[PDB]
């Protein structure tokens, strides 16, 4: 039984200290081990100050938002 958002599905970030808070990014993969605290891996078009466009988030920090659309983060 798959857990978390599907691969390639857009999710809105709910981590307040994240550089992409309330932004959206494609789900690269979700780790299926229940022992992993932050299994969801999300990649973004906008890099942060460390020039990193991907990060691993918790299961409770992604809400499966729709596609961004024209001129929308």
């Amino acid at each position: 039984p798959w857990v978390g958002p599907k691969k390639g599905s857009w999710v809105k970030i709910l981590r307040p200290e994240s550089y992409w808070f309330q932004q959206r990014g494609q789900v690269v993969n979700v780790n299926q081990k229940p022992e992993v605290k932050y299994p969801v891996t999300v990649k973004f078009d906008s890099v942060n100050y460390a020039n990193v466009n991907t990060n691993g988030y918790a299961l409770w920090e992604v809400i499966e938002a729709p596609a961004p659309g024209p001129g929308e983060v």
């Binding site: 229940p34 022992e35 992993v36 605290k37 299961l59 409770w60």
Partner: protein, 131 residues
């Protein structure tokens, strides 16, 4: 059984939900729970049900809505009369300039306009609570 991160998060949620309810009670005694701090004064609840309780208007809490409405309109009339009869009609400036004295009735009445404003506010607050 091993404690997965989901189980730890579940314990976090249970602990927070229980403790946030417990600390509101009479068994936590934090300085932020003193009188003059966040909680309302014991016998004088200000806001309940998202409506100004009758205790907001202080000593007027026992007044009826009709009494407050009558006082509000009467004070509005008297204070507006005083202001208009002191500023524009029957000016007192020339009379007091030549050594005279103010018409004390005008001065006393003119202070009843903001009193009337807050009186009609209190009338509405009383009407909301059904008093």
């Amino acid at each position: 059984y091993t404690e997965t991160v989901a189980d730890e998060r579940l314990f976090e949620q249970v602990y927070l939900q229980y403790t946030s309810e417990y600390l509101k009670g009479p068994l936590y005694w934090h300085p932020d729970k003193l009188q003059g701090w966040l909680p309302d004064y014991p016998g004088t609840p200000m806001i309940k049900e998202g409506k100004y309780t009758s205790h907001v208007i202080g000593n007027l809490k026992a007044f009826s809505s009709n009494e407050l409405a009558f006082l509000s309109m009467l004070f509005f009339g008297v204070g507006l009369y005083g202001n208009l009869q002191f500023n524009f009609y029957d000016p007192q400036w020339a009379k007091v300039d030549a050594g005279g004295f103010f018409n004390v009735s005008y001065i006393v009445e003119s202070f009843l306009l903001p009193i009337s404003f807050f009186m009609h506010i209190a009338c509405y607050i009383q009407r909301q609570n059904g008093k």
